[PDB]
Structures are given as structure tokens and as C-alpha cells.
Amino acid sequence: RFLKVKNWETDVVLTDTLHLKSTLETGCTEHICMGSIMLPTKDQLFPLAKEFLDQYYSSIKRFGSKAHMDRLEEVNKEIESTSTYQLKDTELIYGAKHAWRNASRCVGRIQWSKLQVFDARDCTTAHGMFNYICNHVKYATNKGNLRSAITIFPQRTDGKHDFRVWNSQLIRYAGYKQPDGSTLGDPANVQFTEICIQQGWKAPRGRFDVLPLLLQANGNDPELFQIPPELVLEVPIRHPKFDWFKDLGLKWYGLPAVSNMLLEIGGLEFSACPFSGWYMGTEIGVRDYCDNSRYNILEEVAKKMDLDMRKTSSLWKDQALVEINIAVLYSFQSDKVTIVDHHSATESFIKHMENEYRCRGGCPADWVWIVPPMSGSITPVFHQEMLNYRLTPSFEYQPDPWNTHVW
């Protein structure tokens, strides 16, 4: 019932007790591990609210105090009469910070307590949503000196009036299928780009076209808005040694901003809660640029490097991979846009895990996601045992609304 995790590089053993507080299910059983699988009423609501408020009052060293008991009663009364309840601002901020703290797939959680929460629960329209999101984008970007932020739209009610951002991230590039049979731009965004056009968007029809926002307020049909281009900070990619690298015509955006998740706090569900931090360089250089089903640029780069592409054992892909990632980091750094390399980020996470173990009795972590997609074992996280379990408040994946919405 008390569990040990060992770091095999340092021999340091940590004891996890925080898992016993875990409630939700992993997908694994005693017979089968699903560690590598990507997607593994008033009666229900009060236990959830109470569990949350208890941990909140505990956190402010007021557990079992009159103010604690009184807020539990107030929330109980409100659930009983209205079928739901409203979080206090203090509770919302606390909840949002803890959802991040609990995100077992996030390597950047050393930062979890520095999160600017924008309360958008008074929002009623998609134009209103657009305004809130522009303000988030501008605040978070901060002229390249990025600041972590979340904007929280109104909570789910009957489920027929959901707020949703249809984009998977606030800022992404369009993808287009060609008569050629090839894909122009980001192949990940083909379906979404089509939905945008089908709603009226006029695609510039290039390789790096920032997508419009498709915002759904109050369960209405979603509406298109272009983010002011001056608010979208992008970085041209060049290499510190390779003159020709700029000729590839590569750029990326500075602000990673996930907009498709569901924030659960005290049993309440926030279906539109875009949040943003700053990039670890491998997400762009390894995944966005080099996944075969993404921009898939390895071949092009390897050729400009004049590497021997005849055999896999020359490690031409691996050489080109490093150079691409060097460029990404150099480019952001030169343009003073916050980025973190995978060495620095994973070192920080180990330090964070140690803090969490001593101050909280553990840190839920998903090794499969935490270990970077390149150079795994030369980062300290590769050698660190991690226990994965689900705590609330939480961010959860939710299905694309276009499958769910009725027009």
C-alpha cells in the first residue's frame, strides 16, 4: 500500500503515499498494462465537491474550521436547490493550479504554482470568447517573454450548452490535401482546415497559414475569428552553422496553447479552458517537424547535409534530427522567445518530483510521455521510476466537438 520508486542512475529511492488518495481508474489491470495506450447528478456531485473543498481548506491550513464547515454547508445547500454550484474565485485559482500539478504527462510542472488564471465565467457569446482569448494570447506571449496562463469559460450545465474551442491549440497551421495526392502544410489539421473552409474561411493556401478560431458559446454553432496577426508571435528557423537551413522556409509559433481539454474541479466541468506555457524544443524539432505524419522534413534536411541516405545504419536520420533541434532552440533563443531544451526541462522535473515527494508524498508521472522523443536515456527522467495515477482537479482529453455537435 506504500510504494517505492527508484532512480537507477542515482540509487535514490522515494516513497509514494499520494497514490492512495487517487480515485479514478488507469485502464490497467493486474493482468494487463495499458501504459502505452493514448486513450485508455446531485448524488454524484456532492462527494466530489466535498473532496475538493476538504483539500482546499487543508491547503490554507483551515481544515475543520468554522469557515470550512460553513462553505461545505453552503455548497451542499446550493447543489440541493440548483443541481450545481459556483466556485469562489479562490477555489477556482486553486483548482486550476492543481489540475496542472496533477497532469501526469506534463514535464513542466515545476512551474505549476505560477499560473495566471483568467476567470471568463461571465462570458456569454463567441465574440466574448474571442476577446478573452485574444487577451490571453497577448498576456501569455508578452513580447516573447512567455507567461503561463489559463482562461476558464463557463462550466457545463445540462450538457446542451457547452462552451468549446474547436481548435485543438489556439495557434496551429492549416493543412490541405492536393490533386497531387500530397499534403500541403500540417497534415494533422486537414480535417479542421476543411471545416474552417466549409464555414467560410478563405485559406491563404500555404504551408504555414495560422488557422482561425472556431468558437462555440453556450452550445451554439461555432463562429470563425482570425487572431490579429500582430498577436501571433512566430519564429523563422535558422541554424547557427548551416547557411542553407533558412532556405527550407521553416517557421513555428512561439505560444503552445492547448484548447481542447476539460478541466474538472470539485466535480464541476469546464469544457473550454485554453491554457498555455512555453515549448520544450523537442515538441517542435522532433515531433512537429519530423513525425512521418507531420511536416516530415527529415529527408529534405538529410539531403542538404549530403548524408549517406542509402542505409539506416549510417544514422543519417539521427544526425539530421539533432541539427533540426539545434536550429529550433537557436532560433527561439536568438529572437528572445522563451523555450526550454529537453536536458534542462527533464532536470527541472526531477527536482520537481523530489520536491513533490517530500512536500506531498508523491507525484503522478507518465514515463511514456515524460521521457523526450529524442536522446531518452541521456536525460535523467529515463532512469527515474514513476508511478502513474489519476488525481483531481484534472485536465482530461475530450472528443472533437464536430463528432458531437448538432448543427
Ligand X SMILES: Cc1cc(N)nc(C[C@@H]2CNC[C@@H]2OCCN[C@H](C)Cc2cccc(F)c2)c1
Ligand Y SMILES: C[C@H](O)[C@H](O)[C@H]1CNc2nc(N)[nH]c(=O)c2N1
Question: What is the rounded CA–CA span in Å between residue 359 and residue 121?
Answer: 32
Question: What is the rounded CA–CA span in Å between residue 56 and residue 63?
Answer: 8
| Strand 268-270 to 116-119 pairing | unpaired
Catalytic residue among 252, 278, 316, 367: 278
CB 219 within 8 A of CB 160: yes
User: Is there a catalytic annotation at residue 278?
Assistant: yes
Q: Which amino acid is at 195?
A: I
Radius of gyration in angstroms for the set of CA atoms belonging to the chain, rounded to a whole number? 23
331 or 388, CB closer to Zn ion? 388
Q: Could you say whether residue 276 binds ligand X (CB under 6 A)?
A: yes
The item of ligand Y, Zn ion, ligand X, none sharing an interface with residue 256, based on CB under 5 to 8 Å by kind, is ligand X
User: Is there a catalytic annotation at residue 106?
Assistant: yes
Show contacts with a copy of itself in window 16-35 (CB under 8 A). Answer: 19, 22-23, 25-35
Q: Could you say whether residue 322 binds ligand X (CB under 6 A)?
A: no
Question: What is the rounded CA–CA span in Å between residue 41 and residue 208?
Answer: 45
Residue from 50, 177, 383, 390 binding ligand Y (CB under 6 A): 383
Q: Which three cell numbers stand for residue 73?
A: 454547508
Q: Which three cell numbers stand for residue 398?
A: 475530450
Show contacts with a copy of itself in window 353-372 (CB under 8 A). Answer: 366-368, 371-372
Q: Which three cell numbers stand for residue 367?
A: 514515463
Tell me how crowded residue 255 is: count the other CB atoms within 10 A of its CB.
26
Question: What is the rounded CA–CA span in Å between residue 50 and residue 198?
Answer: 45
The item of a copy of itself, ligand Y, Zn ion, none sharing an interface with residue 378, based on CB under 5 to 8 Å by kind, is a copy of itself
Q: Could you say whether residue 186 binds a copy of itself (CB under 8 A)?
A: no
131 or 169, CB closer to ligand X? 169
CB 260 within 8 A of CB 270: no
Catalytic residue among 71, 109, 164, 172: 109
Catalog residues that contact ligand HEM under the rule CB under 6 A.
100, 103, 105-108, 111, 115, 148, 150, 258, 261, 275, 277-278, 280, 283, 340, 345, 369, 395, 397
What mask of x and - would describe binding to ligand X in positions 141 to 180, judged by CB under 6 A? ----------------------------x-----------
User: Is there a catalytic annotation at residue 363?
Assistant: no
Q: Could you give phi then psi for residue 284, rounded to 5 degrees?
A: -75, -60
19 or 405, CB closer to a copy of itself? 19
78 or 400, CB closer to ligand HEM? 400
Question: What is the rounded CA–CA span in Å between residue 253 and residue 232?
Answer: 7
Q: Could you give phi then psi for residue 235, rounded to 5 degrees?
A: -120, 115
109 or 156, CB closer to ligand X? 109
Q: Could you say whether residue 278 binds a copy of itself (CB under 8 A)?
A: no
> What are the catalytic residues?
106, 109, 278, 283
